[PDB]
């Protein structure tokens, strides 16, 4: 019953998930200059080289593309992480105009829309078991800026007229997430917690410092699709991302000096 209209929207959300108001919501806004390197950081390793990519799905609040996650396939390890997590899916915030969309801001400002590729910490054993732990998830966010195109993203885009509705899903095998990654992996990492209901807090968010460029005509197709399901009246799928919520007794740390 959660979306992201103003009668069910993220003011609405606390009503039924009270963590809402947490003491570790995500996301946040990224002050740049208050941020510390932090030299304890590993190196972070993105190992995503054997993904298997199954599906894509619309789940009416954004599309997912799932991988195979019964075995080590694409982990991401190392810098704030304590083990290895294995990707399970990742999906898109974005906007209806280009000057919003984006989940975290990076000194307030907003990108156009955010990446947020999940994972699991292994040592717990299922994603579900996962969500009841403090570190059972890390999720690595992208954000996406307007101008050349990307083209590792153009697969996504071209699939989504087959997905426009809640509930539909399509093939989607051998997708290869490493193009959708920027050159540079420097980050800004803290604790936080799922962006949408049920806001669990269970993340260590890394936040990638390079944007992303994908063009006008990609994520005008991302803003095509639709929250509602077929037959139904049409609610464009945009505006999807939560505000910046209170950072409460939390510091980001960054990877680079
Ligand atoms: O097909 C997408 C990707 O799938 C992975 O399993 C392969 O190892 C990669 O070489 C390929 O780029
Ligand atoms: O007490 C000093 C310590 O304060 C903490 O809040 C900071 O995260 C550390 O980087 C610093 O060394
Ligand atoms: O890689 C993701 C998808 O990209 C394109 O849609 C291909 O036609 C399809 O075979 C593949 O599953
Ligand atoms: C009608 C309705 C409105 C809002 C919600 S919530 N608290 O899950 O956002 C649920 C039902
Ligand atoms: C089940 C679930 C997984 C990941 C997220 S997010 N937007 O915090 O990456 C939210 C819910
Ligand atoms: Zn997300």
Same mark, same amino acid.
């Given at each position: 019953?959660?979306?992201?209209?103003?009668?069910?929207?993220?003011? =609405?959300?606390?009503?039924?998930? @009270?963590?809402?108001?947490? !003491?570790?919501?995500?996301?946040?806004?990224?002050?740049?200059?208050?941020?510390?390197?932090?030299? /304890?950081?590993? @190196?972070?390793?993105?190992?995503?080289?054997?993904?298997? /990519?199954?599906?894509?799905?619309?789940?009416?609040?954004?599309? *997912?593309?799932?991988?195979?996650?019964?075995?080590? $396939?694409?982990?991401?390890?190392?810098?704030?992480?304590?083990?290895?997590?294995?990707?399970?899916?990742? =999906?898109?915030?974005?906007?209806?105009?280009?000057?919003?969309?984006?989940? =975290?801001?990076?000194?307030?400002? $907003?990108?156009?829309?955010?990446?947020?590729?999940?994972?699991?910490?292994? +040592?717990?054993?299922?994603?579900?078991?996962?969500?009841?732990?403090?570190?059972?998830?890390?999720?690595?966010? #992208?954000?996406?800026?307007?101008? /050349?195109?990307? @083209?590792?993203?153009?697969?996504?885009?071209?699939?989504?007229?087959?997905?426009?509705?809640?509930?539909?899903?399509?093939?989607?095998?051998?997708?290869?997430?490493?193009?959708?990654?920027? !050159?540079?992996?420097?980050?800004?990492?803290?604790?936080?917690?799922?962006?949408?209901?049920?806001?669990?807090?269970?993340?260590?968010?890394?936040?990638? +410092?390079?944007?992303?460029?994908?063009?006008?005509?990609?994520?005008? +197709?991302?803003?095509?699709? *639709?929250?509602?399901?077929?037959? !139904?009246?049409? !609610?464009?799928?945009?505006? *999807?991302?939560? @505000?910046?919520?209170?950072?409460?007794?939390?510091? #980001?740390?960054?990877?680079? +000096?």
């Amino acid at each position: 019953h959660w979306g992201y209209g103003k009668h069910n929207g993220p003011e =609405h959300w606390h009503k039924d998930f @009270p963590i809402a108001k947490g !003491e570790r919501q995500s996301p946040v806004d990224i002050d740049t200059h208050t941020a510390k390197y932090d030299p /304890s950081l590993k @190196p972070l390793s993105v190992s995503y080289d054997q993904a298997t /990519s199954l599906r894509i799905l619309n789940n009416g609040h954004a599309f *997912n593309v799932e991988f195979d996650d019964s075995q080590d $396939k694409a982990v991401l390890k190392g810098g704030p992480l304590d083990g290895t997590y294995r990707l399970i899916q990742f =999906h898109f915030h974005w906007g209806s105009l280009d000057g919003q969309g984006s989940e =975290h801001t990076v000194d307030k400002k $907003k990108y156009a829309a955010e990446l947020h590729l999940v994972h699991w910490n292994t +040592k717990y054993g299922d994603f579900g078991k996962a969500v009841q732990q403090p570190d059972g998830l890390a999720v690595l966010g #992208i954000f996406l800026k307007v101008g /050349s195109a990307k @083209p590792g993203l153009q697969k996504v885009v071209d699939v989504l007229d087959s997905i426009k509705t809640k509930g539909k899903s399509a093939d989607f095998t051998n997708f290869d997430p490493r193009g959708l990654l920027p !050159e540079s992996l420097d980050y800004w990492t803290y604790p936080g917690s799922l962006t949408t209901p049920p806001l669990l807090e269970c993340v260590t968010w890394i936040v990638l +410092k390079e944007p992303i460029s994908v063009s006008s005509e990609q994520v005008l +197709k991302f803003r095509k699709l *639709n929250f509602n399901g077929e037959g !139904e009246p049409e !609610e464009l799928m945009v505006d *999807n991302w939560r @505000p910046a919520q209170p950072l409460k007794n939390r510091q #980001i740390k960054a990877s680079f +000096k």
